[PDB]
Every structure is written in C-alpha cells, then in structure tokens.
Amino acid sequence: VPFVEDWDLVQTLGEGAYGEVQLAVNRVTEEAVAVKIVDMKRAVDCPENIKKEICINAMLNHENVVKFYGHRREGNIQYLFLEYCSGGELFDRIEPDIGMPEPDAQRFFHQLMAGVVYLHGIGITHRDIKPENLLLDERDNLKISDFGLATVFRYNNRERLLNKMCGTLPYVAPELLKRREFHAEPVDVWSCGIVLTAMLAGELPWDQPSDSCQEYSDWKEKKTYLNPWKKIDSAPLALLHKILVENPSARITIPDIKKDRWYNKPLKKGA
Amino acid sequence: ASVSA
Numbered sequence A: 001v002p003f004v005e006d007w008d009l010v011q012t013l014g015e016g017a018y019g020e021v022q023l024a025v026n027r028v029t030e031e032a033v034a035v036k037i038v039d040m041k042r043a044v045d046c047p048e049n050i051k052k053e054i055c056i057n058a059m060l061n062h063e064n065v066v067k068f069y070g071h072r073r074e075g076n077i078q079y080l081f082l083e084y085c086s087g088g089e090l091f092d093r094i095e096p097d098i099g100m101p102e103p104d105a106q107r108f109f110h111q112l113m114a115g116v117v118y119l120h121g122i123g124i125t126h127r128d129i130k131p132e133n134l135l136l137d138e139r140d141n142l143k144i145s146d147f148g149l150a151t152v153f154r155y156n157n158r159e160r161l162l163n164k165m166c167g168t169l170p171y172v173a174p175e176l177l178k179r180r181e182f183h184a185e186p187v188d189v190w191s192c193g194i195v196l197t198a199m200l201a202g203e204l205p206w207d208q209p210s211d212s213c214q215e216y217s218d219w220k221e222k223k224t225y226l227n228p229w230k231k232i233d234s235a236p237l238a239l240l241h242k243i244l245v246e247n248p249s250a251r252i253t254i255p256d257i258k259k260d261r262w263y264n265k266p267l268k269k270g271a
Numbered sequence B: 001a002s003v004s005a
C-alpha cells in the first residue's frame, strides 16, 4: 500500500538531554505512535547506551509497559517507534498538595505493580520509576516508560547485585546512598512507594533518604502527624510503612504488597 | 518534519 510507511511528526511530547519524543501520525492510516529521536553524536557512549535500551525494549511485551514496535537508523540518528499514550504523564494527574482520589491512586498502584512484577519476572530493573515516566493511555491505563537506565539483574536464574548510583534522589532507595552493592528489586519497590506517597499527598516526603534530611529522620521516628503522612488514610499509610523501610532485606516484597489490606480493599468503581 | 517506517 503506497505511503503506509510515512509518518508525519506533529507534536513534541517530551525533550531532554536524551533527545526528544514526537507524536507521529501515519500518513495513510492516521495511526498514532510516539517516536523517540536520538542523535548518537551527542555523547561518545550514546551509541552503546541507546543500543542497550533498544535491546531491553525488544524483550518487553506487557500491557503496563510502553510497547516497542521497532527502530530505524538514519546515519547518526536512531528512531525508536513506541506505543503512544494519549493521557500523558501520571505526573500531571497529581495535584500539588492534594494528590488524587484514593481509589484512583489504588488503581494506578495496581497497574504499576503489574508492570513492575512483569519486568522483574524477566530479570529487568527500571532504576528510575517516578510519575514523569509512568504514562497513561486513552483509558487511563498505566504504562511504564523510558528504559534508558534499565538493566538486567537476573540472567540464567542467577542474580547480579548492582552498584551503579542512578535514579532520581527523592525516589531513590536509601541503600544506594549507604551501601556499595545492593539488590535490584527492593530499589524499584521503594521508588513505587514514593510514587504512591505523591499520588496520595501531592508532595514528595523528602529531598533524599538520608539521616541528614530532617524529613527522612522524622519518618524513621514515626512522626506521622506531620505531612505528607497526615494526609494519608490509615490503610494506605500501613502499606507505606512496609514499603519505606530502610533495611532492603526487611522491606516488603511485591508478592506481599499484593496481599496487603489496602491493596485489596474494594474502592474503585469500573469506568 | 517526517519519518519513514
């Protein structure tokens, strides 16, 4: 069918040092996809980096992960064709100092756990989960995006401990700031707990999880009459108490988050 | 701006 491979770039979806993502609409079918555009000339290692990110994206196929359709190289430019999520970023559904309705946060939290369980099941950790990277489709289904920091932590049934310091400070687990090596899975569980805090309170609990940060010390001392905790009902707060545990070995795992009381409370009506 | 598939 002539022209079915032509796509018009009609809108900037996102921009950053990594490059940009544009909304692409098919010339013939008007199908919409997002196209991430990367100039491999921007950094000496961008070549290996983007190659790794495409490798990882090729391994993924889950309803709560941004689908990867393929890629094309044009000289120094790499074009990644990705699932377009018309509801934009979860970031923009979080009202400052309010958050969002608890049942809505619970449904987004269920979908985030589903995508994270999927990734960990195939041995991939994301390493930078935050609202800016959790996208929404036309029906508000959540899809994890941006595997630019993703890496394999399990291969051939053997776990590799991680040591790279990466992520975003307000969402990063405390063991990355205190230990030379750490397990991957608890770090992604932690950032999911900060995302839940933001969805239910509309504010991040601390600049970083270190004793030097007063807000983090206050949490460790269970001062839950202070914000953001005072804004969170008791049932989800009990779940946050299990997720935001400094020792990653005592931190709740996803199979136990799935058994949590708040997690299983009927709260949200179907669309 | 455009791209081919």
Ligand SMILES: CN1CCN(c2ccc(-c3cnc4[nH]cc(NC(=O)c5cccnc5)c4c3)cc2)CC1
Pocket: A013, A014, A018, A021, A034, A036, A066, A082, A083, A084, A085, A086, A087, A088, A089, A092, A135, A145, A146, A147, A148
């Ligand atoms: C106010 N205005 C703010 C922006 N909104 C807004 C609306 C839609 C989208 C958006 C939509 N679909 C997408 N598919 C893949 C994306 N990004 C990626 O895969 C990706 C991104 C960075 C690095 N690596 C990968 C992506 C981003 C973003 C923002 C629209 C409303």
